[PDB]
């Protein structure tokens, strides 16, 4: 047997060291190890994606230097906590980030090392705020070909993981592979202060600065009117026989809103004389 | 061994290798580099391998010989003339040359 719906908690410094690590080595696939804490069966957390030394000849299982395991992990023991590894990371920048033959070559070594040994797959050139590029797996064994595959006792959480059916090549690799749920969980010690960094360090930065303006007069008036004549052409062609005439398009775009933000923000900039000055 | 400035001595037989507009691109590079280093001295030995006169569309590679030759026929003249580009020519029998040249 019986198997509970699993879950991958993050600390998001995982994702930051994946974007920074795979951003640093961006023309090349990288290989690494993932640290965290084995909390229970149905959840497991990542709390540390840490740097792993480069291979030049082959990205493989030989990228794990055991003296860097003793020295790196031991100097993490004399860092604030000796926590337990939860798996391993890598990258695939060159394509749509599916499980290379190296990953199946070292997966049995990694699950000889660990219980879960969950993959971490990424293409570092995807997005700037949007995509969730990281990909996570579990190679279930071929010895369980007698029993039914991926039991997942309730399959309600898995049925709600089953929303995208993502990556049809990995779905070509549905033989003994399946994705897992990854939430982007909260860090109340970190989320609100990240909102302070983010929001208060971006809303005018110092929140005192701009409270440019006389050249957006001319730029804005040309940008407006040069679109306004082609906006006003079509009432030549507005007529009756509704289905017999076909050209429906709005002509009000960026002339309400851009002009409201334009003249209102720059007329409050005209109010910065009285607002700033007395 | 007298001026010793910029003697670009083209042997003009090892230009073509197999390709299409490769020798043309070499002509563009020689004329642009020649435009750059203002006191260039062009030399070309044995024009008759690449020069010719004309055919009646025989061997198909002689087409590329003709367009490669018309690289010279235009780009020696063009609309933008050359400055200080002294083209020194050598031959064995100058009867077989193109009257375009």
């Amino acid at each position: 047997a019986v198997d509970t719906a699993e879950q991958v908690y993050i600390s998001s410094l995982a994702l930051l060291k994946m974007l920074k690590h795979g951003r640093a080595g961006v023309p090349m696939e990288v290989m690494g190890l993932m640290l965290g804490e084995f909390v229970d069966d149905y959840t497991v957390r990542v709390i540390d994606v840490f740097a792993m030394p480069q291979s030049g000849t082959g990205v493989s299982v030989e990228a794990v230097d055991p003296v860097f395991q003793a020295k790196m992990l031991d100097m993490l023991k004399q860092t604030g906590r000796p926590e337990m590894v939860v798996g391993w990371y890598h990258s695939h920048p060159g394509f749509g980030c599916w499980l290379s033959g190296v990953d199946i070559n070292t997966q049995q070594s990694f699950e000889a090392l660990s219980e879960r040994a969950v993959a971490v797959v990424v293409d570092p050139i995807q997005s700037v705020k949007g995509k969730v590029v990281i990909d996570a797996f579990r190679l279930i064994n071929a010895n369980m070909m007698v029993l039914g595959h991926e039991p997942r006792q309730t399959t309600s959480n898995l049925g709600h993981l089953n929303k995208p059916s993502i990556q049809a090549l990995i779905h070509g690799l549905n033989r003994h592979y399946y994705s897992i749920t990854i939430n982007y969980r909260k860090n109340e010690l970190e989320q609100k202060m990240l909102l302070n960094l983010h929001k208060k360090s971006w809303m005018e930065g110092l929140t005192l600065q701009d409270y440019v303006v006389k050249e957006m007069l001319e730029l804005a008036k040309n940008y407006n009117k040069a679109v306004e004549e082609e906006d006003k052409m079509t009432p030549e062609q507005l007529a009756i026989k509704n289905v017999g005439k076909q050209d429906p398009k709005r002509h009000l775009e960026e002339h309400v809103d851009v002009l409201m933000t334009s003249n209102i923000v720059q007329c409050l900039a005209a109010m910065l004389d009285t607002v700033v000055f007395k | 061994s007298q001026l010793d400035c910029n003697f670009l001595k083209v042997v003009s037989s090892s230009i073509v290798d197999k390709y299409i507009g490769e020798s043309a691109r070499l002509i563009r590079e020689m004329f642009n580099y020649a435009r750059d280093h203002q006191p260039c001295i062009i030399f070309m030995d044995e024009i008759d391998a690449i020069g010719g006169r004309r055919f009646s569309e025989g061997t198909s590679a002689d087409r590329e010989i003709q367009r490669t030759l018309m690289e010279l026929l235009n780009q020696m003249d063009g609309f933008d003339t050359l400055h200080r580009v002294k083209m020194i020519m050598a031959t064995n029998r100058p009867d077989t040359l193109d009257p375009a040249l």
Binding site: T274, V275, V276, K278 | -
Partner: protein, 94 residues
């Protein structure tokens, strides 16, 4: 020392404080532009000089206190009228 700048400062002020004649305030202010302490325009259509930024002198304690007077005056007027403008713009937030 004087209130604000008066925007236009006379040959009697420069010449009387300077204990000099009228026809040396010109060389005084141009020579001051050679020094570079001021960037003032030589307003002598009326012999009454316009002011710009200057290098200051030593802040006395009464300069601290009167500076706190007009400075706090500026502070709570821009802050108070600031809160008034925000109070007029208070109903349009949602």
């Amino acid at each position: 020392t004087r209130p604000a700048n008066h925007r236009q400062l006379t040959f009697e002020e420069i010449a009387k404080s300077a204990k000099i004649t009228v026809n040396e305030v010109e060389l005084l202010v141009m020579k001051a532009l050679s020094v570079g302490l001021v960037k003032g325009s030589i307003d002598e259509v009326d012999k009454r000089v316009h002011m710009t930024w200057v290098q200051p002198r030593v802040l006395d304690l009464q300069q601290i206190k009167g500076m706190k007077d007009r400075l706090e005056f500026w502070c709570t007027d821009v802050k108070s009228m600031e809160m008034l403008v925000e109070h007029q713009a208070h109903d349009i937030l949602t």
